[model samples]
Target chain A: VGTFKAKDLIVTPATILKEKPDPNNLVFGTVFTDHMLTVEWSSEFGWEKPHIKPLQNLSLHPGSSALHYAVELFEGLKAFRGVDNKIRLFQPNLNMDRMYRSAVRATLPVFDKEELLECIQQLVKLDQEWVPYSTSASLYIRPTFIGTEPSLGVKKPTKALLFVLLSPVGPYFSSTFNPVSLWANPKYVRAWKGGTGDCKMGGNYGSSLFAQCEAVDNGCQQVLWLYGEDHQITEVGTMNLFLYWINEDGEEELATPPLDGIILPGVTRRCILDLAHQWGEFKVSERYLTMDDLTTALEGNRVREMFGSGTACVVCPVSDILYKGETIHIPTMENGPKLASRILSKLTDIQYGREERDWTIVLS
Target chain B: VGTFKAKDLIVTPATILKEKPDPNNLVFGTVFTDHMLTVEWSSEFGWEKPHIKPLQNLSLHPGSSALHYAVELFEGLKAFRGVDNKIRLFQPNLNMDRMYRSAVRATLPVFDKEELLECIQQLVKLDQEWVPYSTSASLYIRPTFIGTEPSLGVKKPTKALLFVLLSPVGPYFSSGTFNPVSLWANPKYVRAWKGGTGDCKMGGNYGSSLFAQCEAVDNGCQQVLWLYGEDHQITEVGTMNLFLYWINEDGEEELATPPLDGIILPGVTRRCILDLAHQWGEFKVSERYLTMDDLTTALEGNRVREMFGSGTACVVCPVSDILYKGETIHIPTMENGPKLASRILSKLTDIQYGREERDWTIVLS
Candidate 1:
């Protein structure tokens, strides 16, 4: 057996240089870069030497538990080409921590966070040319882990693989930061109590595809996921949901769903809350926001803005919500910057070196 | 771009003769036959040619949706070598139907049920030598379908594949059927929900319940009985559905199971029991809810004659005690061969084999 090492990574750079796609003409995850990072792990051999090689396909057996039992987990973060001639990555450490929790839930192998991050940094630097030139066309980094053992039981995976793929994505939504409509359907549920929704596993997302199609059929851009009998809004599409409004108590506030077990603990959502509270503009809350609360607040015209926050979209505004045969219009500035735009600009500023902060680490 | 045909099943025989494992020594899914049936599908080209070839590893791209997303579905059934010197399949049509429903839930490509069964029949007939001749052992067939598209996005797959593998095994329980077991009832977890993919036999169901199973095993219990709502209505027994038998108010025997409320799996055994109960005419059965409160009343009156879990594996497993709400309620099963369980097992076996003219059995070869 040729035992390899992860720390002592074997660099197999792509022999043939590939043509780069135009930064302006990029899709979300369809196009890939020239090189990728991969590491294989086994129960006998801890972890094989990590490789930074040409982008390629992986060969697996038909009986792998991952194909049958969904023993797979992944993390999504980004690297930004700043205007200061330095490229930085947003809070990837937070993604790594969340990924560890997800791997545990999915029954996959756990890896050292520091070591994994080091390999990821190496790959990002080696393939720096793949990073988008335009600030808007940022590179999206996906670190995926899957069970590779060829077995047919529902037990924990004895062998696994950790690999990272880099794709230069243009934007999450086709409309960019423009307010997109949402279809609120209680017929479909994304996350439930005692479910895998709290962890970012693949099982949670596959079940949502049918609902997303229903949302598209209803002429809505995304689906606002709700839970329980009262229909409390938990999340919006693949991002954390948020609402900015004045409460019935006549106090101005900015609120989002709590980090309860039914919601995904998103890094961008946390960063938004932290940045908002640091500014001390209004009351920032991590409380359960139900449809009834939003209805009453919207009827009283207390809603200033409504949007979703995630790494892909940063801050996605909402213009309308169709729930229970009623259309609730959200107020947003039609022409210029509003509260959501303000957050997006501020977040991109910190990420693109417009604002110097510890969160963004330049690839020096 | 290779538009292949699903109907024209190609056969590639194995060149090297492989030794079959001893039937008594085989586990559930560890062993496989020499040949497998496969068919591929694509969004633009539709389905490929169905092939019965030598067993081999499937080389998939790391980006395949089946590896990342749970875009996979499967069905399980068994083939019996009867005393009539012929091989038979038990309700494979039902497996195909359920597999179709599961495929819908997983967003995989759906195929014609009749065509799929025909292909499966062809494969099973080709590998009939793997079927165990002993009455206690039989061939277990697993038909699996997966998304083959190589991408990272969360959407419906543009490519897919359907395959089947054969494994012969012994009885479901290592300890044949003597010991009745205890159950650990927990309200903290649920097997599935009303709006979730509970109806489909997807992979998400088993992984979530393993940890709960560990706790139950640690407490010396054989299973965990799932409950729903504040009243604690019994839903399922880990992998099976539950039923309670009693003497009704009119002095007639009565058996009841939960209705189709999206909580319980529609098991073949449960359905068979219901149909048989309807034909018996001696007992009145109702598809109704059963709760721990009713359980207490039945026990207090000594009317709880029998309780068992039903599945394809163990036709029925007797439940002696239940550990719920800090109380261990014991049912009357100190004696052997409870009438209902014995009758159901005998009737199922009779139909499974060629002992009687029945609708449940299909002759494959």
Candidate 2:
């Protein structure tokens, strides 16, 4: 088992404090810890011993397929520091689950999910101080996998790498909750049918920059991605969108776009759907929510609230949508629906180990 | 002129002859030339000095967006060693024009097209020996642009580098002008839709099709003809554009390809065919829809004369059989007569090899 055993894991602590970031002034993804976890894979050798080394640049062949063909994927989740002085991870197993499908579709290598999680946890605990002390800020974990074939071919890669990067993030809004305005245009589609949209691949995100710029130019914070002929509301910015409203049939409902192969089944999106479905008071539906239905519902004052859910910001409310040269207003609330404020309280409570739940994997 | 001037390119020759590939035996891109041209850029400092240095690995941050977000694209063109002992490029301006649009879609920076072309010309001349001496072989040039942002985020790349790789390539068909093999009518896969990145020459397009290509290869086909819509109109073949010839409604023996209607790639080869056919005036050429209805019509009594694909590599590839919807369809052309595709192929090769001259051929001399 000594030929760099797949089951073997190594821990090499960094020298000294190595310059830690002040959590008071932390920015989203701007500051990273000194150490990183990397696991190399080749068709010749299945998986090598995991390495924890200093965070550094990767030496790659200029002709690597990942650089030229975009054979790379990533997943983002967070580590929260609860009020009871306990460090925990919020359902990271879901992230590992999503990565397997992404790796399969992206033609990257697949490895033991539980083993990779164990390795990342060791890296996290080694740099334990990197986790913010404040309740508002959290440590964002980015697990990235890339095809490392060192040639200019478009075929499937024969080599690959899986590495993890940690970033200390400040609260998205600095305050408790701040709603955002959005711009919706069908001309700029983020993902499409019969494509790699369902997977958390890099191609989907890189293609979204121009549309993000367009959104900013139009005085909107995010882009409300619409698809198909009827302009179904698919996603918002890089997050899964949520619309809480009273349906046309006089029933309370929380609806998000279904996993129809064009939507990114985000971890937070899953958590919210599961939590809302279990509540049992309101109807929780996973179906296509068209832009016209939203505009019509907003026009009729039935929309309680609209928000986007993702790993970065658990829930971000939307105040308005600029669609077809018109602004559609979304009602914001503190309690019932863009029920983000209420949900976030419970989410943070569970994350901080105050709610006493099994959802948050408390690190001891 | 104060900073690095793109016009005043720098060349650093290797101390000795670097490892060179055997031109007598070379694959499409397996063997790379000695020197490469690279130009670095940043949002803060703009473009850097163009350099032709020895080929080496690129030291990039592990968090580079190019590795994670697929923020990269490339263009493929060739340089031929003509009969007159002169080296020439085949319509390089078209490649530059195509790169400008690809850059816009991929969110990379654009530069003075002429300046980069000049920089490449210098590199190509410096490594001119890498161009094959055989008539069946030439030097293929690949210009690649990638985001070099060293952070973990899905936003725009703050830094990028534009580099070129030169490869010695033999004929794609090799043994002689062998027609391509193709698998058509994927009931499960499609290349591009009305709202996707069909027009941009990005990496995702190539990477996404590999799975389908694997299926095609397993089934004894070399390429896959990607069709769109429930009606199944032909869009592309592998990475090339598709063409068909048959009796039109007006009894005109014409050739046509699918329109540049946001579904197909705007290929330089496709443009050349369109221009050359219009110039010949022997047949009418059009850019319109060719659906399964037309394909089925050709299979039965429509008397389909020719079918092929066009690209920078092969110039023109004849199609003999298309395995569509569980059946094989074949197109039989005259044995010796130059069919439209072969005629176009010879015409292009003549221009490429300089047997015949056209504006498409630009000499470095």
Candidate 3:
């Protein structure tokens, strides 16, 4: 009947900690920290005491609704070991807000965002040694929420579990930030109106694997998810898409799909728009960009750069797009990806504490 | 590397069994039996030895793909205690095939259908006493397959779990008569769509439906009349397939339902009605689209006879009213005895409860 409090948090430290893996040989999401945070909730008694214990398996009823009805959601963020030797989390409040929204959409019990954030900070601080020492690597934090109701009926869950896990990951692309190619096909759709596309739910990701494999089959690194009959470009892989081109009105513009229910609102995407607006350079627009619009711009040679923005890879430049048996060159790298490279550098500088900003939350 | 075998099954009986609940007071899927069936599969070693152990909670890695990525699917079927005192499964192979298709779509590992069914049968027989003795009550079986891969990546699972749980459920219509339901039809919320996993019984499809269902309930409707596309095509009612019996265009009697396009689930009950209608040869039976305009035109002309939903839970449920766009579209199903809906329900229950001889029932020895 009540929400959890950060001051009432219970801590049970792990007896043993695993050795940190070599940062140069690190793989994304393969290795984890020593501890995790878990909080349980039930309709009968609102929120149980939060626990920070050793990372271990979960004991669930075989009939948990999450496993049967996909009543689950998650959030992704990173903790960076700054050049000043102080650990900082890049805009964690945004992740908390999004996680709360995802939980509401999932029909799970709500928790105090501030309380949950404090618990997560406690978890990261407890495992500070696991944060990668290299400037190129950081700790990936996954905050997952799932309905643990032990019932088979497809209804709102009476019980739920919220947990956070930390995995140390290396740079998305080693040595050089490679510009990736995409396979664009209208046969597959990522999200739609009146669907959970804008939310960070598990359903949106699992249903995309088949199409991702198809992209690989076509010799592409990722998928360009198209939506609606006109084939409006919605997203690239799991990230928000950005296009910098000279508009039909002959004005320089940086455009990305608006969050109108079919696009996930990425934190990195928001950061780029803010930085661009602050700089007051080109015209920044969040509008629809169809395949026809892009191909026309490419043919007219008005396109400057195309890239994807997300938590894992801050900015991934787009080189080529394979659509309808035609490989269209984006020319992002050839143009110096002047905008994409600058955005990435500015983000990394703030993230690694090279450029001091209010965006970074220094962990105690 | 290899599939499981019934001969490799290991059974561990429970020391204490749960007391059976009162049949008259039973709710749907809330009670369980004494034991369950489980099988583990890993990409490296194929299927592990199967086990029929005492019913208990599962110890899973916190990062299981089923929990984080919704890489899960399930099948629902029932066990009927016949008038002749023999237990029978109603067309379980259909459920098995559908489950297999769902697993494929979910990108989980493959398994032998017959081998899995045999293991389920063993689980049912071991907990046979848990099956209600009343003809109106039967044991509900749920076979769930989920990705247990303990990683954060969005890829096909390397480890998986397949398990079966049994629960006794009372008849869908507690009064032993047709209880008509009202539906709320709103195009603002789409249940499933083209290029999505709607045909398969995936968890995401159901999870996305809850919000609409809540909206329907809040508007005083019992269930959602799920509509699709610009034409307002009636796709399904809640979790079941919709059917309309009417004197269609050109004044010919027709039993029409939506075709198995990519959006419609291939329900076993829907297939049964289609098969039975075809056998009767009484009127035109069709698998075609039925839009709201078509229904409105037929209803306005007094040519629409009955409208019902078909699913495993309620063999057939009649629809009496629909709240669409702030107007109540009254259906004459209950007013006209819903003769077709009642007929189909009686025939299916007859075969299911063994009042009539049918080859669809798989008898347990």
**Most accurate candidate by lDDT:** 3
Q: Sort all candidates by lDDT, best to worst.
A: 3, 2, 1
Model 1's CAPRI class is medium
* Regions of model 1 farther than 4 Å from truth: A1-6, A42-49, A174-176, A334-337, B1-6, B247-252, B325-336
- Tell me candidate 1's interface RMSD: 1.8
| Model 3, runs deviating above 4 Å | none
Name the top TM-score candidate: 3
- Residue B230 lDDT in model 1? 76
DockQ of each: 0.56, 0.66, 0.75
In candidate 3, which residue pairs get closer than 3 Å at backbone N, Cα or C atoms, i.e. clash? A1-A46, B1-B46
Residue A169 alpha-carbon offset, candidate 1, angstroms: 1.1
Ranking by DockQ: 3, 2, 1
Report the C-alpha lDDT of model 1 over A284-324, residue by residue, as the tens digit: 98998889999898778888888888887899888899998
- Clash list (residue pairs), candidate 1: A5-A49
Worst 10 residues of 2 chain B by lDDT: B1-10
